[PDB]
Amino acid sequence: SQCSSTLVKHIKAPLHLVWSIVRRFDEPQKYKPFISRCVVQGKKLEVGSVREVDLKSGLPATKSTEVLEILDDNEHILGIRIVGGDHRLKNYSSTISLHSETIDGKTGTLAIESFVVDVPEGNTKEETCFFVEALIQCNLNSLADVTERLQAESME
Numbered sequence: 001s002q003c004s005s006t007l008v009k010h011i012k013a014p015l016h017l018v019w020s021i022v023r024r025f026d027e028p029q030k031y032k033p034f035i036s037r038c039v040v041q042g043k044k045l046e047v048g049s050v051r052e053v054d055l056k057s058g059l060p061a062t063k064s065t066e067v068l069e070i071l072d073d074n075e076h077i078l079g080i081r082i083v084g085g086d087h088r089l090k091n092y093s094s095t096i097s098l099h100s101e102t103i104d105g106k107t108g109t110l111a112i113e114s115f116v117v118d119v120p121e122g123n124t125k126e127e128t129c130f131f132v133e134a135l136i137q138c139n140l141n142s143l144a145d146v147t148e149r150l151q152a153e154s155m156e
């Protein structure tokens with residue numbers, strides 16, 4: 001009744017720049033294309049911070065409420081739970097972690113995003129798992145696009 005998996009993305013941008021985007025729990029729309037708004041009252045970037053995101057129109061859900069569980073700036077780990085929303089995901093926990101990597105002399109970042117979530121009522125484990133994996137993979141591909149563009153702009 002639970003399911004889990006892990007997605008990865010090789011990003012052609014330095015860890016420090018990628019982390020500077022990923023750690024913004026209060027502004028996931030910096031790179032998540034399915035978020036239209038994000039409101040965080042109270043303390044913004046501390047364990048326990050709560051965010052309410054509005055999803056972009058035409059999606060099968062419209063809102064999510066999420067809590068920051070882990071914000072490790074030394075190890076570059078961002079841990080988040082979903083606690084409310086009108087999507088079908090219950091007890092969803094997310095962990096994204098970044099690791100520097102060097103491919104052919106070129107330094108970059110390996111992003112690894114893992115999840116755990118309940119298998120919804122009517123849906124199956126494969127159904128839920130495959131759906132979430134595609135969404136995370138899309139989000140990690142947007143992260144690469146955003147940070148690789150920022151890397152390029154920094155090159156003047």
Ligand SMILES: N#Cc1ccc(CS(=O)(=O)NC(=O)C2(c3ccsc3)CCCCC2)cc1
Pocket residue numbers: 028032034035055059060061064066080081082087088094132135136139
């Ligand atoms: N139906 C549905 C649905 C579609 C888009 C979003 C916006 S989202 O694409 O930004 N959502 C995410 O990235 C997830 C997340 C990661 C850390 S906290 C929440 C991981 C992927 C599954 C949904 C939740 C949320 C729900």
